């Protein structure tokens, strides 16, 4: 889960560095943030992932 999230938080963010459509840019932002949550679950901090979900 750590590695799966780590690549996702990077690859999708990289795709957002050159994207034009506003919704696409915010779409890839969600994917990167979702990857950040997966990293949290991969380090044994489930409540921080939940905390990041609500915020």
């Amino acid at each position: 889960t750590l590695c799966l999230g780590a690549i996702t938080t990077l690859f999708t963010a990289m795709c957002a560095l050159t994207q034009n459509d506003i919704k696409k840019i915010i779409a890839f932002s969600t994917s990167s943030q979702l990857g950040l949550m997966m990293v949290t679950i991969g380090i044994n901090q489930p409540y921080l992932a939940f905390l990041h979900i609500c915020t």
Binding site: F11, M14, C15, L17, T18, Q19
Partner: protein, 55 residues
Amino acid sequence: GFILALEISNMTKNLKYHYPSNAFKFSTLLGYFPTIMHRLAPYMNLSMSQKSASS
């Protein structure tokens, strides 16, 4: 990252030319994942589904 964003952002204002690179096209087209998988797997699956499975 913020500073590099503005500094790179202002560089676009300069009247210099641009060189289409490989990383830029790699980031622009979502890393090519939604151009091979979304065009190869449908071709492999929908061609086998007709020439082999049915005909």
